[PDB]
Symmetry: C3
Subunit: 167 residues, 3 copies
C-alpha cells in the first residue's frame, strides 16, 4: 500500500458534511476540495475555508500541497496563497482563498470545489550541516550539524491539530 | 526511456509561425522557460491567459507539469502566476495565467521573452484510498468509503481531452 | 549520504551576527523555516526581496529547493510569496520575495519571526526531450526536434 491515502472525515457517519475529495478525471493529479459551509468572500478579502476532511495517512514519501484550481483562479480572480500540509498534521484541511477583485465578491458554494490537493514527493532530510565558505581562500568551516533524531531548533514536539502560525 | 523523457506537442502546423519552444536556460535549471505565442499588454491589476503554443504529449514517469512564476518577471514586473497544475491526461495547449499587481503599469508580453517556467514534479498517483471516521475516544475506525483508481469514484467525466479552466465545474 | 542530506552555506563570517539558521519547527514539518538577516516594514501593496543569510551548498539527490509561503505570515499579515524556484546550480544567497496585499497596513519583518519556508521537492531532471506535431485529423506524428541533456 505505497500509492495509498486515508482521508479522515471530521463529521460522524450519517451527519451532513462537505462533498468528499475527488479526482475529476482518470489522469487528474489532484483531489478537488469542497467547502463544508457557504460564504461570499468580500472584494480584496482573504478567507479560511473548512473542507470537512483531514489526512489520516499520506502516501509514502509525500506531503499534501493545496494549490489553486485554474477555473476558480481565472473566472473568479482568486489565488490560493498558501497550502503546505505537514505529515504530522491531524487537523482539518482549510483552504486559504484570496479575492483580487476590487468590486466583486467570490461565491463559496457546497457543490463547487474551491482548490485541489496534490500529494507531492519531498525529501525528509536526515542529515544537515551549516558551513561557512571563505570566498577568498576556499576554506570551509562547519558551523553546525544535526541528524533528524536530534530534533534541533524545534518549536514543539507534537503538531497535533495546530496550524496557521502555531509555531 | 520514459523515466527521464518528455514529449512536447506543437499546436501550430510546421509551415507556420509560433512561440519559441520550451527550453531549459542552464544545465542546473530545474524548469523549462515558457514563451508566449502572441503579444499583449496586461492592464494594471489585470489577469491574462496566455497561449504558449505547446502541450505535453508525454510526461516523465510519475511526474506532472507545474507552471510556476519566473523570479525576474515576478520582481521586475510586479506579477504572479496564481495557478499552474497540469493534469497528465490534458491534451490541450498550455496557457500561462499571469496577474499584474501594479496599479499604474501595464505588463508587456513579448514573443522573445519567457513569461513562466514549467517543472516536472514527482507526485503520487493514488491507487487505493479510504475515507474513515476516527473516534479517538472509543479507539474505533469506521470506514466510510474505499475505492481503487479504476472505480472512477465521483468523477466528472472519463476523458479530459483539451478541457481545462474549470471544465469540471458547473 | 547524499540521498537525504543538505548543506546550507552561511554567508556571514563565523564571528558575525546573522539571520537565524533554516530550521524544521516539528518532527513532521516538511519545510525549513527561513528568517530575515535584517528588519524592515513592507509598505502597503509593497513587494520586498528579503535576504535570509543562507544559500544551499548541497541539495539532497534529485531535489531542488522551493520557497513557499508560511500559513501564519500569509493569513495574519495578508501576504504571499509569489516566486521561489531555486535551481540546483545556484550558489547565491536565498532571498524571499514577499508581497503585501494590504492597502492600509505595513508588514513587520523581524529577526525572530520566520518569513517563508523551504521544501526540498523531488523533480525530474529530463535527460531526453522531443517536440512533435500531431495532425488532429489524420493522427500522423512529425518529429520537429529532439535533444539529450
Ligand atoms: O492552506 C493551508 C495551510 C496550512 N494548513 C494546516 C496544515 C499545516 O501543517 C498547518 C500549518 O501550516 O496548518 C491548512 O489547513 N491549510
Ligand atoms: O495554469 C494552468 C492551469 C491549467 N491548465 C490546463 C491544464 C490542466 O490539466 C487543465 C485543468 O486545470 O487546464 C493550463 O493550461 N494552465
Ligand atoms: O524567490 C526566489 C527565486 C529565485 N531565487 C534565486 C535562485 C534561482 O536559481 C535564481 C533564479 O530564479 O534566483 C531566489 O533566491 N529567491
Ligand atoms: Mg481540476
Ligand atoms: Mg510551519
Amino acid at each position: 500500500s505505497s500509492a495509498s491515502v486515508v482521508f479522515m472525515r471530521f463529521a460522524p457517519p450519517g451527519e451532513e458534511t462537505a462533498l468528499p475529495p475527488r479526482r475529476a478525471t482518470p489522469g487528474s493529479v489532484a483531489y478537488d476540495l469542497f467547502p463544508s459551509e457557504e460564504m461570499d468572500i468580500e472584494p480584496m478579502g482573504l478567507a479560511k475555508i473548512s473542507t470537512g476532511y483531514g489526512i489520516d495517512k499520506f502516501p509514502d514519501g509525500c506531503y499534501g500541497q493545496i494549490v489553486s484550481r485554474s477555473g476558480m483562479t481565472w473566472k473568479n480572480n482568486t489565488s490560493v496563497p498558501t497550502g503546505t500540509i505537514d505529515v504530522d498534521y491531524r487537523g482539518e484541511l482549510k483552504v486559504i482563498l484570496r479575492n483580487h477583485s476590487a468590486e466583486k465578491s467570490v461565491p463559496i458554494r457546497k457543490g463547487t470545489s474551491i482548490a485541489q490537493l496534490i500529494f507531492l514527493r519531498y525529501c525528509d532530510v536526515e542529515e544537515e550541516q551549516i558551513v561557512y565558505i571563505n570566498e577568498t581562500t576556499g576554506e570551509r568551516t562547519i558551523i553546525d550539524s544535526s541528524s533528524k533524531k536530534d530534533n534541533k531548533n524545534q518549536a514543539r514536539s507534537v503538531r497535533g491539530t495546530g496550524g496557521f502560525g502555531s509555531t
